[PDB]
Write an enzyme that holds these catalytic residues in place. Structure first.
Site, PDB file in Angstrom:
ATOM      1  N   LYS A 153       0.821  -1.199   0.000  1.00 23.78           N
ATOM      2  CA  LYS A 153       0.000   0.000   0.000  1.00 23.78           C
ATOM      3  C   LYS A 153       0.857   1.251   0.000  1.00 23.78           C
ATOM      4  CE  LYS A 153      -1.883   1.948   3.445  1.00 23.78           C
ATOM      5  NZ  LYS A 153      -2.663   2.256   4.668  1.00 23.78           N
ATOM      6  N   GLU A 179      -2.365   8.627  13.119  1.00 22.02           N
ATOM      7  CA  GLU A 179      -1.383   7.665  12.661  1.00 22.02           C
ATOM      8  C   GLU A 179      -0.617   7.074  13.831  1.00 22.02           C
ATOM      9  OE1 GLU A 179      -1.564   7.430   9.292  1.00 22.02           O
ATOM     10  OE2 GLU A 179      -0.682   5.472   9.743  1.00 22.02           O
ATOM     11  N   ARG A 180      -0.190   5.825  13.678  1.00 20.97           N
ATOM     12  CA  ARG A 180       0.876   5.324  14.529  1.00 20.97           C
ATOM     13  C   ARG A 180       2.152   6.083  14.210  1.00 20.97           C
ATOM     14  NH1 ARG A 180      -1.907   1.072  12.495  1.00 20.97           N
ATOM     15  NH2 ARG A 180      -2.746  -0.510  13.906  1.00 20.97           N
TER      16      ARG A 180
END
Ligand SMILES: Nc1ncnc2c1ncn2[C@@H]1O[C@H](COP(=O)(O)OP(=O)(O)OP(=O)(O)O)[C@@H](O)[C@H]1O
Ligand SMILES: Nc1ncnc2c1ncn2[C@@H]1O[C@H](COP(=O)(O)OP(=O)(O)OP(=O)(O)O)[C@@H](O)[C@H]1O
Ligand SMILES: Nc1ncnc2c1ncn2[C@@H]1O[C@H](COP(=O)(O)OP(=O)(O)OP(=O)(O)O)[C@@H](O)[C@H]1O
Ligand SMILES: [Mg+2]
Ligand SMILES: [Mg+2]
Ligand SMILES: [Mg+2]
Lengths: 434, 114, 383, 478, 380, 52, 104
Positions: A153, A179-180
């Site tokens: 991705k 987000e992480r």
């Protein structure tokens, strides 16, 4: 000018004895270990606003002086943001000095009005054969991306960035909504070592702005980071006149953060658990991603489906805006095919003979027919034998097996670790070859 | 500290202001002095619209509302406990609680009058 | 804390006035010292106490009517929803960020109304009748209320005239009367809009050959949709010439939920001009299931108690009082008609949902569009 | 006290400074009340009747008394309303005495063990789910199953037993009809007068048009009438038809007294609503007379979902459970008693010893029949020793059937279970075992039913002589 | 009549009596002589009950600051409201009364971090509970620190060996990631965690000083029998040389069980911020979310799904984002987190379960049907 | 003064149509709370309401 | 959870003496996911879970042989002969639990 009345978690009440700030205006807190920005959510009456904090409120005192800025959150915008990491309130996170702002723009903005809308509905060609043949991207549309880990991705994202910036001459913004930090750092490094983000004096030649809001940020901070990325894209659309890409990473986390913000503000939740303003907080975002008479913004938004339930109100409300879906799957990926776009599962509203023409439509519908009637004799391949088949079905197997090979493509950004150079494919070449 | 007992126990948040107003006027022995100037303010709200605008209007500032009060109560029948009351009732916009706090003050009074 | 023991405190009972004429001569200089700090007092206008979530609580407005279109000093318009003993609850037809505490609210003196007439034909208006197509203001028009009650039993007659929709599956199998209401229900991306668009284009094709009293003037209400879709639709209608007979009310996905809620009522008010004057109307409320969601947002932001799925409980009345205005009038009322085509989007084919079964209990029939027939190429995918 | 506000059957009353919690008050319009929410400023009064005759500023007089009902033997045969007062048009309650409706249930020293049986007359019940005097047995089921029919037959059967036993061991029934129609209970007084069961039956009826504090109070009013017989050495039997409707009337008062809602909307105190009431059905010790009170609460489920909130409260209160199913009801099995889920926590220690020995194998043979009929539903195979289990189990489920308003004594039941668990109804077709056992009761002489009832047990002097006569019978088919 | 607008009073504060009582009892001339309640750094308890004290005054207290009551029992000022302070109590509120004095300590919540914490079993606030004396070789540090950003991180490359063959083979764990251990009750989540800790002790005898991993076990909502049994296991194995144990148990107050994972993470971040490696295990993070829901519902904060606040995702994410692999210019240290979420009937679509599944990198899903099949560790 | 009984009908004078209010509750401060048999659009907060 | 913990944490062995506690726990609708049994489960050293299906098979005590756990079922506590027999019994019963889906 004002002063802190209440601190209930991430929700601060500020009392202005003068005149109150407008709703969605940004407030700054005078004297705090980090710059604390409050965004005005409502007017409570008795000269009090209720605000949501963009950072932690620990160490905030009742009576701290709060300065109204007279405007919403204004972020640095322009070509000097390219290749930079910027947070929700515009500060540089990448530790590379201040951001060279061509302008500062408020992140709250109405959608383009009805006369500025374009009525044309054409292709944004991407240079990837499977997402230009079987699921074309509308120029100025929203695209669901049902990927995951290990399906390529990230390489697909930076290939879309690179291909649009090369062919169409339009930049890209990555909105890291919720987000992480490990994955955000991995994306930053993979954009550095693939040439879509450059550093130092070569900063201006980079193609993408990163707007990051981490998971450890309060829900008001990561409920607004998509608006910051949309403002960075809207400058390129309105002022530069380009065809911009936006990557709202996990639109579900945008929904989640606005749900948490509505819950902290005291609102009664609607269906399954969501904000009452779910369709309106989504449509406030998704209606600014359109085609104007200047340029367009196109969104490749990663979509999460919560209980593997497509009738859940967050994906059901999100799919009402998506003009295309690109499904990345592991079964195509462990077959070696890159990009791992599922050609049968990927859908497009643009796949219609009145907007792409009967030739492109019939070629794509034929490729879909060949792949589909190959992928439903697989449970007679195993139980009877591969040479049990008729002479015509073996022709379809030999045609579909070389069709699904031909859907793969080497990517220009992947050549720093795969060795094989990347091949941009035009649309006419794709239709003619298929 | 200490405070005298109320004659009758009664309700909350306007009838406990009146209990405390009775409990400090019993110590200063001006029990029937506070009561008539409570009736004066009710007459003051009757014939002054700009004094009841400091009790019903939500848009008067909380500093303006408490500065008119102290600048009309200057050492004339002040009693120091109906004067420090009215700052404390204009500090929170509770000047509209006066028609409720005097009714509870009266029923505390004839229980003292036996 | 009695009431008869408080009315006895209206009469004077002090007999000692050493503080009345102490402050009665000192009040006016005090008020004159703090004079520029006063906002001017407000009785027949209004002033915003608190604004938030798209609901303004307004002090003052002593003589507003219930359901009256008020105006903020920003220009954005409201609706006096609940009149209370001390304030007025106003729903804001627009973005509530331009409204501040202390803003003057001006009463327009009229219950919420939209311009109706012949001059609204051809035009793309918003949910409140204000035109968004950029070609000026609405001329040759008059304002009329959006919440008029539907005609009664004695003001109606049976449907007789056949209102051809131009779709073979519909006009063969599910034929639509002239004052009927027919539900277009189906999943997402199953051709629900396309049936209504084919009806509108067919009415353009039929209006060129009927003797001026059998002409059908369409109204398209686009509730909750994207603005690009409405732009492409208006482009399509002008490309086929249908816009000469249709109105395009549109309250899109970015618009406020009072505007998306009210847009079917303004569209039906515009179409009731053609019903009440002996002509014939057709109205398509595209995704009435989005109007129900905007109304649920309005109800939960008013802290009204939620019911089934989260909906307020008068979400049946919301759609019933709207669709009941699609009648076939009697001969002494002109003989006009209004055909409604409400569109309801289901989730995964579940037609036993709440809003779906609500509108099935209102309309005269359904046009089911199955996704299995649609994926197999059978289009229109009529179940 | 003056009425501050009145609406929805709640009057908020200023004053009444010495009113007790749960005290009956009186409005000057004549309607009654009960003080429930004692707050510092008002009293929350639920209104026993129509609140439309109450205005603001009416006078409320406290009566000084907790809510009480007329208890005693003058209540038998009388159809009373939700608190004592008769509605059958037969005059005032003579020979009666006031007693509080909220009494503390008898404690551990006041009890003794449940040993003597209460015969329902429903042979699905008396064989598999036996009920002793002093036990609470829940009749739970879905909407239109045999729930009041089991309750009706238990009351009709007591009239059939009270004429044949001495004066001490007679059971006086109470039927509490909460939230039903007046038409429904008028068919029941018509039924209890026609059979003659109204001689031993009080009929407390808070119907659907009654005020919510009359339906919430009627089981306590009825239990106070039934507790006269428990506290004076006699035996009661109370049936609370729809305790599920008593909780909906209690939720209405609680939500209108602004008490905050919990599960589904119910108050937190709703377990204590029914456990306070069902613990009053006891079996007293011989120091307190030895009286008993047998309760039959009725709970309605929605789709057979016994995991509802009020359904799981009463399942954990009551000793037994009689689950009636709708899919068993339409298969012809009437009473629709689910044999697998129906428990009786007093066990076989409180049943007929003549059926303690013949129905122990009946609940064992039916446990086998349930398993072999799940597999033969597919249509796989039969084994001729598995099929004999499926053969006899189908005889017993036709044997446990019973028609509507005719209870069987106890001894024509256990003879009919003797005829089925000893093979004497094999070679009889499964379609007419219902029709076969009229012949077994008719042709066997009534001398053996008197020996079985007087012994209470099939002695071998009777057991051989029973099966000696269970061959001299003309079964159909043969 | 013109006084019907004064008929109904309406107040902006429930504690209106507390201001007129501060303005009327110094208005009597006997108690005007130095009788005034101070409000800036002191406070009076208005209400107590269920571990929440509403405090009038404390006009200068900060959000999230420690306060101290008269009885020595500590508290945390959590709802700063317009007239009162909502204080959550760090003990039993049996010793707090109405009218008690609340002194602010002037400090946000602190724990002792340092090398003196190794081997010590502490409370959820750093108080040692093993009866072995005070913590000596330590240093006070803030409990809720900001997680390191993007540029303060590097990628996860070096492996953290669990010693479990299924974990080290199939779902590998690196130094710096957050791996969820999720499963039903009694499926072996704690066993996987303790095997990771014991294997770190077995590895630290064989690697250089800068490759060593120091474990922190946070036992939240467990009983003291379980925690004492686990300390007995760690001392009989020798793993307590490298292990800290933070233990807010079931009898401890809900703010202690809420603050114990943050206390353990602040103790474990000492090793990450000084170039060493850490492994933190938040055992029963579901019990932490339950304790936080208790404090938030009792503070009358608006409930969301299942009853939880809006910021319970913010709770668990600002906890679990502190487990990072730092860059080489910040020492190259590491913190590896193992949150443990107990599911009911395998429902991973629960609220806290989906939150921690979103936050963490991987998951170690343990099944009960595999557990009784003989497959132990029952890794699905 | 003289509040109407619960369930009494009240007529609103000055409305465009015949508005009939059925009294539901006595709110407590000489206020009754009514249900309207027609639409309440146009009701002003001073309108004369006549008890029947 | 804190009320239940403040109760359950007192029922312990101290260095003074011992309390061996057997506590019946009612699961409300045969539901072990209800928060009151799910909160009690973490406080116990041995959970004898009784199940409805074993009672309806006629087996008494209706103890779920798989769902019942103890902290004493370790090989270094009760020996290996007890532990291997218990684990083999549970293994055979889980095998039959998987096979009863395909037998029926
Ligand atoms: N009769 C038809 N024949 C072929 N294609 C059709 C037909 N009707 C609709 N379609 C195609 O189906 C797609 C969806 O159509 P339409 O927009 O009418 O459905 P919809 O129900 O409005 O979906 P959504 O509500 O999600 O917008 C359109 O792209 C259109 O091209
Ligand atoms: N043993 C039986 N044999 C034949 N018919 C029966 C039997 N029991 C009940 N019925 C019939 O079933 C219907 C329902 O019986 P019953 O009155 O007990 O229902 P219920 O459970 O009280 O339902 P509801 O609560 O809705 O009144 C009645 O009409 C009755 O005639
Ligand atoms: N690898 C293993 N081999 C054999 N038995 C094991 C193994 N791991 C765990 N067990 C057993 O599983 C039981 C539960 O283990 P453990 O307590 O570690 O899991 P848990 O999910 O944390 O339980 P709880 O949630 O009750 O604390 C213990 O009795 C233990 O003996
Ligand atoms: Mg559509
Ligand atoms: Mg019945
Ligand atoms: Mg454990």
């Amino acid at each position: 000018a004002g002063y802190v009345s209440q601190v209930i978690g991430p929700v601060v009440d500020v009392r202005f004895d003068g005149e109150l700030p407008s709703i969605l205006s940004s407030l700054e807190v005078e004297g705090h270990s980090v710059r604390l920005v409050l965004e005005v959510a409502q007017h409570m009456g008795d000269n009090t606003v209720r605000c949501i904090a963009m950072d932690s409120t620990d160490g905030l005192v009742r009576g701290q002086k709060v300065v109204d800025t007279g405007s919403p959150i204004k972020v640095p915008v322009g070509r000097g943001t390219l290749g930079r990491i910027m947070n929700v309130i515009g500060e540089p996170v990448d530790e590379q000095g201040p951001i060279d702002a061509a302008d500062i723009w408020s992140i709250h903005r109405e959608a383009p009005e009805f006369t500025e809308q374009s009525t044309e509905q054409e292709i944004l060609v991407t240079g990837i054969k499977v997402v230009d043949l079987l699921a074309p991207y509308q120029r100025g549309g929203k695209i669901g991306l049902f990927g995951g880990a290990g399906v390529g991705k990230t390489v697909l994202i930076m290939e879309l960035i690179n291909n649009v910036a090369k062919a169409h001459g339009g930049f890209s913004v990555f909105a890291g909504v919720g987000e992480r930090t490990r994955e955000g750092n991995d994306l930053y490094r993979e954009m550095i070592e693939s040439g879509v983000i450059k550093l130092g004096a070569e900063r201006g030649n980079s193609k993408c702005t990163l707007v990051y809001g981490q998971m450890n940020e309060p829900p008001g901070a990561r409920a607004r980071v998509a608006l910051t990325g949309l403002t960075v894209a809207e400058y390129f659309r309105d002022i530069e006149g380009q065809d911009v890409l936006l990557f709202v990473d996990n639109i579900f986390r945008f929904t989640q953060a606005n749900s948490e913000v509505s819950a902290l503000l005291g609102r009664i939740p609607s269906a399954v658990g969501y904000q009452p303003t779910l369709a309106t907080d989504l449509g406030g975002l998704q209606e600014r991603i359109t085609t104007t008479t200047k340029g367009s913004i196109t969104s490749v938004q990663a979509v999460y489906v919560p209980a593997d339930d497509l009738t859940d109100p967050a994906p059901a409300t999100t799919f009402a805006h998506l003009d295309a879906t690109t499904v990345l799957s592991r079964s195509i990926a462990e077959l070696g095919i890159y990009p791992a776009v599922d050609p049968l599962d990927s859908t497009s509203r643009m796949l219609n003979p009145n907007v792409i023409g009967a030739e492109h439509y019939n070629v794509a519908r034929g490729v879909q027919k060949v792949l589909q009637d190959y992928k439903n004799l697989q449970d007679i391949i195993a139980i009877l034998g591969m040479d049990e088949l008729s002479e015509e079905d073996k022709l379809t197997v030999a045609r579909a097996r070389k069709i699904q090979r031909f859907l793969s493509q080497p990517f220009q950004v992947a050549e720093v670790f795969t060795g094989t150079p990347g091949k941009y494919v035009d649309l006419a070449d794709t239709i003619s070859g298929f | 500290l200490k405070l005298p007992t109320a004659p009758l126990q009664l309700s909350g948040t306007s009838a406990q202001i009146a209990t405390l107003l009775w409990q400090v006027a019993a110590k200063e022995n001006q029990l029937d002095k506070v009561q008539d100037e409570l009736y004066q303010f009710i007459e003051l709200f009757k014939q002054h619209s700009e004094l009841r605008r400091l009790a019903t209007d939500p848009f008067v500032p909380t500093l303006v509302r408490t500065k008119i009060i102290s600048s009309v109560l200057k050492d004339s029948g002040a009693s120091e406990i109906t004067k420090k009351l009215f700052e404390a009732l204009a500090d929170e916009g509770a000047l509209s609680a006066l028609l409720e706090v005097t009714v509870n003050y009266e029923e505390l009074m004839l229980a003292h009058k036996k | 804390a009695d009431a008869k023991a408080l009315d006895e405190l209206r009469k004077p009972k002090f007999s000692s006035k050493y503080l009345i004429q102490h402050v009665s001569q000192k009040l006016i200089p005090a008020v004159k010292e703090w004079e520029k700090s006063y906002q001017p007092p407000v009785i027949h206008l209004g002033r915003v106490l608190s604004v938030g979530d798209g609901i303004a609580r307004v002090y003052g407005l002593k003589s507003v009517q219930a359901g009256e279109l008020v105006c903020f000093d920003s220009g954005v318009k409201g609706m006096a929803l609940n009149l209370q003993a001390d304030h007025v609850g106003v729903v804001v037809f627009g973005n509530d960020s331009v409204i501040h505490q202390g803003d003057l609210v001006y009463r327009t003196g009229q219950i919420v109304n939209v311009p109706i007439g012949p001059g609204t034909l051809g035009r793309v208006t918003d949910g409140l009748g204000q035109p968004i197509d950029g070609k000026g203001p609405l001329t040759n028009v008059r304002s009329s209320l959006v919440e008029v009650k539907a005609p009664g039993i004695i003001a109606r007659q049976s449907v007789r005239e056949p209102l051809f929709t131009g779709v073979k599956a519909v006009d063969a199998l599910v034929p639509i009367g002239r004052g009927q209401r027919e539900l277009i229900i189906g999943d997402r991306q199953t051709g629900k809009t396309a049936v209504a668009i084919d009806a509108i284009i067919h009415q353009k094709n039929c209006n060129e050959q009927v003797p001026k009293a059998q002409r059908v003037y369409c109204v398209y209400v686009a509730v909750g949709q994207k603005r690009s879709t409405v732009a492409q639709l208006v482009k399509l209608f002008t490309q086929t010439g249908a816009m000469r007979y249709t109105i395009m009310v549109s309250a899109t996905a970015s618009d406020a939920a009072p505007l998306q809620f009210l847009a079917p009522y303004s569209g039906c008010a515009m179409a009731e001009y053609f019903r009440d004057t002996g002509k014939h109307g057709l109205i398509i409320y595209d995704d009435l299931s989005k109007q129900s969601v905007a109304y649920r947002q309005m109800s939960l932001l008013l802290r009204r108690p939620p019911g089934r799925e989260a909906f307020p409980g008068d979400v049946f009345y919301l759609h019933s009082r709207l669709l009941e205005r699609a009648a076939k009038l009697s001969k002494e009322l002109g003989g006009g008609s209004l055909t409604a085509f409400p569109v309801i989007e289901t989730q995964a084919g579940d037609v036993s949902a709440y809003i779906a079964t609500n509108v099935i209990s209102i309309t005269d029939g359904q046009i089911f569009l199955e996704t299995e027939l649609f994926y197999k190429g059978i289009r229109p995918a009529l179940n | 006290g003056r009425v501050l506000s009145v609406g929805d059957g709640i009057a908020r009353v200023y004053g009444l400074k010495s009113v007790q919690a749960g005290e009956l008050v009186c409005f000057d319009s004549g309607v009654k009340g009960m003080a429930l929410n004692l707050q510092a400023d008002h009293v929350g009064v639920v209104v026993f009747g129509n609140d439309s005759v109450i205005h603001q500023g009416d006078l409320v007089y406290r009566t000084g008394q907790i809510v009480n009902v007329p208890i005693g033997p003058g209540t038998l045969g009388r159809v009373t309303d939700g608190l004592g007062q008769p509605i059958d048009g037969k005059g005032p309650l003579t020979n009666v005495r006031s007693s509080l409706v909220e009494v503390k249930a008898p404690g551990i020293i006041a009890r003794q063990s449940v040993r003597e049986p209460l015969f329902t007359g429903v042979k699905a019940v008396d064989a598999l789910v036996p009920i002793g005097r002093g036990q609470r047995e829940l009749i739970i089921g879905d909407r239109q199953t045999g729930k009041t029919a089991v309750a009706i037959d238990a009351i009709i059967h007591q009239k059939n037993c009270n004429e044949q036993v001495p004066k001490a061991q007679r059971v006086y029934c109470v039927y509490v009809a909460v939230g039903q129609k007046r038409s429904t209970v008028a068919q029941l007084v018509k039924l209890f007068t026609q059979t003659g069961a109204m001689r031993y039956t009080i009929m407390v009826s808070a119907t659907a048009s009654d005020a919510a504090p009359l339906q919430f109070l009627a089981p306590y009013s009825g239990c106070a009438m039934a507790e006269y017989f428990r506290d004076t050495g006699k035996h009661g039997l109370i049936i609370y038809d729809d305790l599920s409707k008593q909780s909906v009337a209690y939720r209405q008062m609680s939500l209108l007294l602004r008490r905050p809602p919990g599960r589904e909307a119910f108050p937190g105190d709703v377990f204590y609503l029914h456990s306070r009431l069902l613990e009053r059905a006891a079996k007293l010790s011989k120091e307190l007379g030895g009286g008993s009170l047998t309760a039959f609460p009725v709970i309605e489920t929605q789709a057979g979902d016994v995991s509802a909130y009020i359904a799981t409260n009463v399942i954990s209160i009551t000793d037994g459970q009689i689950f009636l199913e709708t899919e068993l009801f339409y298969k012809g099995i009437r009473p629709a008693l689910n044999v697998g889920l129906s428990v009786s926590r007093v066990g076989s220690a409180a049943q007929f010893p003549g059926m303690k020995q013949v129905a122990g194998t009946l609940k064992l043979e039916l446990a086998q029949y349930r398993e072999v009929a799940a597999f033969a539903q597919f249509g796989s195979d039969l084994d001729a020793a598995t099929q004999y289990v499926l053969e006899r189990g189908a005889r017993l489920t036709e044997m446990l059937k019973q028609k509507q308003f005719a209870p069987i004594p106890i001894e024509r039941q256990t003879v009919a279970v003797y005829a089925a668990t000893k093979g004497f109804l094999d070679k009889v077709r499964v379609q007419d075992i219902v029709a076969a056992e009229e012949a077994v009761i008719s042709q066997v002489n009534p001398a053996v039913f008197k020996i079985l009832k007087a012994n209470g047990k099939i002695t071998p002097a009777l057991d051989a002589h029973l099966k000696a006569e269970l061959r001299k019978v003309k079964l159909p088919g043969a």
